[PDB]
């Protein structure tokens, strides 16, 4: 058991590391056009605002599958029962 | 000569050179557009 139960740490680590840097620097290029747009047309922003949130759900969608796998990972563990 | 009335010609002088929420889209630079620009208002108010 402990290689595989070390192991699962790592791949932990990796499904959050790796959803967390994609996460911050996505958000970082999505972020800085609306604030772009919103400076030059600042009655845009009611709906510049929607249009955001729509891309903000694509965007972490597969992250937010990453966590819950890690979740499952750690309180749990699909690995150990198969010895 | 200024068009006063159609019995009134007037002689004058006017200066040619020497002349709020939101920002255009310049496609080319601010500065080559304003260099053009102030060419076409000189030569139109000289057609005037």
Redesign the interface.
């Known amino acids: 058991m402990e290689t595989v139960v070390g192991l699962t740490a790592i791949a932990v680590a990796l499904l959050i590391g790796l959803g967390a840097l994609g996460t911050a620097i996505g958000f970082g290029l999505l972020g800085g056009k609306f604030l772009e747009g919103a400076a030059?047309?600042?009655?845009m922003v009611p709906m510049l605002q929607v249009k955001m949130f729509i891309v903000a759900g694509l965007l972490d969608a597969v992250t937010m599958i990453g966590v819950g796998i890690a979740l499952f990972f750690t309180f749990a563990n699909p690995f150990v029962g198969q010895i | 000569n200024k068009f006063v009335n159609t019995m009134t010609q007037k002689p004058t002088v006017e200066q040619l050179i020497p002349l709020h929420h939101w920002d255009y889209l310049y496609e080319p630079d601010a500065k080559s557009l304003l260099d053009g620009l102030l060419v076409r208002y000189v030569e139109s108010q000289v057609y005037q």
């Open positions: 030059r047309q600042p009655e």
